[PDB]
From Swiss-Prot:
It catalyses: [protein]-peptidylproline (omega=180) = [protein]-peptidylproline (omega=0). Residues 1-162 form the PPIase cyclophilin-type domain. Pfam families: Pro_isomerase. The gene is ppiB. GO terms for cellular component: cytosol. PPIases accelerate the folding of proteins. It catalyzes the cis-trans isomerization of proline imidic peptide bonds in oligopeptides. Inhibition by cyclosporin A with a Ki of 25 to 50 mu-mol, a concentration 1000-fold higher than that required for eukaryotic PPIases. This is Peptidyl-prolyl cis-trans isomerase B. It is found in: Cytoplasm. Keywords: Cytoplasm, Isomerase, Rotamase. GO terms for biological process: chaperone-mediated protein folding.
Length: 169
């Protein structure tokens, strides 16, 4: 379990380690290194998704590690509440940026191992605090430089805490 402490409240997510192992490992390495601390949700589109984890206040982009394999051929769908990795045109270009689907976004789903089929890799899902996700998706937005749908008041991930539960027979 991972908890995003945002300035709108907590978002509690469960990772899908078995179905997106490289993605989850990449995501947890960034969390534990402080990478998402003081990043913002820089692209907020109501009825679509909220996207964050790349930019500090002022649209200061952080340097990232090497990009990761797209694991979207895991069968998981971009339904409301799931997290998926943002990326550019190249299917294997994801680094740190992720988004939370706020409706079912079927058109993001993997349909084949190709430029247009690869889609977006679901690796986790919100298990608590969708109210916080729904409050964020509804904030006022505007333009910033070459970017659009930037929240007029920064929506900030202040920090991330990881929760583990270990079981012994």
């Amino acid at each position: 379990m991972v908890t995003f402490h945002t300035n709108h409240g907590d978002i509690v997510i469960k990772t899908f380690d078995d179905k997106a192992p490289e993605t989850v490992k990449n995501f947890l390495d960034y969390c534990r290194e402080g990478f998402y601390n003081n990043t913002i949700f820089h692209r907020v589109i109501n009825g679509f998704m909220i996207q964050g984890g790349g930019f500090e206040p002022g649209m200061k982009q952080k340097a990232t590690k090497e990009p990761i394999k797209n694991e979207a051929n895991n069968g998981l769908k971009n339904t409301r509440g799931t997290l998926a990795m943002a990326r550019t045109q190249a299917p294997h270009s994801a680094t740190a940026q992720f988004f939370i689907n706020v409706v079912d976004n079927d058109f993001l789903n993997f349909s084949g191992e190709s430029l247009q089929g690869w889609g977006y890799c679901v690796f986790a899902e919100v298990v608590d605090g969708m109210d916080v996700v729904d409050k964020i998706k509804g904030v006022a937005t505007g333009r910033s430089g070459m970017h659009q749908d930037v929240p007029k008041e920064d929506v900030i991930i202040e920090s991330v805490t990881v929760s583990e539960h270990h079981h012994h027979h």
